[PDB]
Amino acid sequence: IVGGYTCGANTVPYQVSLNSGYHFCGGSLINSQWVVSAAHCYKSGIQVRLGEDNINVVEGNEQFISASKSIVHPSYNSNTLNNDIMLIKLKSAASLNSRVASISLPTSCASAGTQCLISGWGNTKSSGTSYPDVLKCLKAPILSDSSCKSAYPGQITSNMFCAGYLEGGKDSCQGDSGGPVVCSGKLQGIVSWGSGCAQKNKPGVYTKVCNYVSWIKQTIASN
């Protein structure tokens, strides 16, 4: 997260870190046994880490639970990042509490101009690299589909939306992948892609969660 601020310990209790010996992606707890993340975050040997603030310091509120299974969207296309969404099941049910909470799935989509919260432990530099150890937060509006497509002609699908600032300076970035975009108290996006980070006229591109709610619900009910 570039141009953001320190969230504050566990103020984003639905935020998870995916760990394979190191943090490599964000995700979102949607109930005691299930996490939503980006398809591009897929890999074997994944451990879900809940209730984190500093990912390099054990602070006493964490729950580490291995993944029993991953389900990448059936139509995920890695070449274009269309349908960049995946579900991860926990080996054991998380013990939900103040610091470890689920985020509600949308009942509807969200409109351009809506303010959202994006968070993660990804790079905080626009040029160059610096990873924070605590969680960073960014307030960012959903952008019109037409400024999204003009930034990335022929690259935006109906399963994507842009959010951010066209002037630059404020954006998500590498390491924020798979993390939540929360608008009007629901999970409306997943950190997916972008050209660089926080660059002018290159806003962040997010998976459009409201399109996948039936798939998520059907998939978690049968797995």
Ligand X SMILES: N=C(N)c1ccc(CNC(=O)[C@@H]2CCCN2C(=O)COC2CCCCC2)cc1
Residue list for the binding site for Ca(2+): 52, 54, 57, 62
Residue 191 binding target from ligand X, Ca ion, none, CB below 5 to 8 Å by type: ligand X
Q: What is the 3-state secondary structure (H, E, C) of the chain?
A: CECCEECCCCCCCCEEEEECCCEEEEEEEEECCEEEECHHHCCCCCEEEECCCCCCCCCCCCEEEEEEEEEECCCCECCCCECCCEEEEECCCCCCECCECCCCCCCCCCCCCCEEEEEECCCCCCCCCCCCCCCEEEEEEECCHHHHHHHCCCCCCCCEEEECCCCCCCECCCCCCCCEEEECCEEEEEEEECCCCCCCCCCEEEEEHHHCHHHHHHHHHCC
Q: Does 14 bind ligand X (CB under 6 A)?
A: no
Q: Does 62 bind ligand X (CB under 6 A)?
A: no
How many residues sit close enough to ligand X to count as binding (CB under 6 A)?
A: 15
Q: Does 177 bind ligand X (CB under 6 A)?
A: yes
Assess whether 84 carries a catalytic annotation: yes
Q: Does 73 bind ligand X (CB under 6 A)?
A: no
Assess whether 177 carries a catalytic annotation: yes
Assess whether 53 carries a catalytic annotation: no
Of the residues 116, 197, 209, 210, which one makes contact with ligand X according to CB under 6 A: 197
Give min distance, CB of 85 to ligand X, in A: 13
Residue of 37, 53, 73, 84 marked active site: 84
What span, in angstroms and rounded, lies between the C-alpha atoms of 63 and 90? Answer: 11
Q: Does 40 bind ligand X (CB under 6 A)?
A: yes
Residue of 40, 53, 119, 176 marked active site: 40
* Binding region for ligand X (CB under 6 A) out of 47-55, 94-102, 172-180, 209-217: 172-180
How many residues sit close enough to Ca ion to count as binding (CB under 5 A)?
A: 3
Q: Which of residues 120-149 bind ligand X (CB under 6 A)?
A: none
- Measure CA 185 to chain center: 15
Q: Which of residues 20-59 bind Ca ion (CB under 5 A)?
A: 52, 54, 59
**15 or 172: CB nearest ligand X:** 172
Nearest alpha-carbon partner for 129 in 90, 92, 173, 163: 173
Q: Does 193 bind ligand X (CB under 6 A)?
A: yes
Instruction: List active site positions.
Output: 40, 84, 177
* Binding footprint of ligand X on the chain (CB under 6 A): 40, 80-81, 155, 171-174, 176-177, 191, 193-194, 197, 204
